[PDB]
Amino acid sequence: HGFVQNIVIDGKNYGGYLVNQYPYMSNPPEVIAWSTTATDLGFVDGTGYQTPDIICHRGAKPGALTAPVSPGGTVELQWTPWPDSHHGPVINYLAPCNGDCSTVDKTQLEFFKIAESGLINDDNPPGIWASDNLIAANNSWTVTIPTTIAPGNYVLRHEIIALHSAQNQDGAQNYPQCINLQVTGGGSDNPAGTLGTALYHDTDPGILINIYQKLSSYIIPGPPLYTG
Ligand SMILES: [Cl-]
Ligand SMILES: [Cl-]
Ligand SMILES: [Cl-]
Ligand SMILES: [Cl-]
Ligand SMILES: [Cl-]
Ligand SMILES: [Cl-]
Ligand SMILES: [Cl-]
Ligand SMILES: [Cl-]
Ligand SMILES: [Cl-]
Ligand SMILES: [Cu+2]
């Protein structure tokens, strides 16, 4: 359980959607982060993978604001403290807004995978995962925006999938968090995208999995990584 509280881009902080605060206030601020209704700080499990909740989390709506990113710049997402038990991959996607991200129809977003990290070491099951790297980095993840994609406005869909209960069907816990970015530079690719509701299925080999056994490999969920 947790959420993204802060985003660091080009030497400033952009506050996140504080789902434990803003849903209870009259006058929540405009932010680059999507609003959600996930006030339990929880997840979308496999029962939700073919529902709109998986796109940017339960009840999500676009952020009002969009953050510029320098060409090939970084976006650092800072989480609330991530539980050690919640082992799993960290995955990042972009989808073009083709206009202002604040007015996009989330159900039409076509995401391409720009980064993925999975099982890092398995000397001591259940092992060390990308989520454990995130914890070790004081609950942070750094995304590098590709220089090879067409400039424009994009949604970044940043996600942890916790696998501590994933031995049974619909037991994996997905924690998507979306933010709005303006990508800048000289790239030209328009990578092939996947609708949010087509990213995952509840029988995928990196979804329906017993992490407590020895693992010789791990198939990170979702469509293929884009590399320009
Ligand atoms: Cl709100
Ligand atoms: Cl505001
Ligand atoms: Cl305000
Ligand atoms: Cl925690
Ligand atoms: Cl655009
Ligand atoms: Cl270990
Ligand atoms: Cl471990
Ligand atoms: Cl362009
Ligand atoms: Cl496998
Ligand atoms: Cu949890």
Residue numbers in the entry: 1 to 228
From the reporting publication:
Three structures of AA9 from LsAA9A and Thermoascus aurantiacus (TaAA9A) were determined in this study. The data for all the three structures extends to very high resolutions. In TaAA9A, the completeness of the data cutting at resolutions of 1.06 Å and 1.2 Å are 40.4% and 94.6%, respectively. Here, the His residues (of the primary and secondary coordination spheres) undergo unrestrained refinement, while the residues in the rest of the structure undergo restrained refinement. Our results suggest that the His of the secondary co-ordination sphere is singly protonated at the Nε2 atom in most if not all structures. Examination of the micro-environment of this His residue in all the LPMO structures of this study show also that the distance of the Nδ1 atom from main chain N-H is between 2.75 to 2.95 Å. Therefore, this N is likely to serve as a H-bond acceptor and reinforcing the view that the His is unlikely to be doubly protonated.
Lytic Polysaccharide Monooxygenases (LPMOs) are a recently discovered group of copper metalloenzymes that depolymerize recalcitrant polysaccharides like lignocellulose and chitin by oxidative cleavage of the glycosidic bonds. In this study, the focus is on AA9 LPMOs, where a conserved His and Gln (His147 and Gln162 in LsAA9A) form the 2nd coordination sphere and a strong H-bonding network has been shown in the crystal structures. Our results reveal that the conserved His residue of the 2nd coordination sphere in AA9 LPMOs is generally singly protonated.
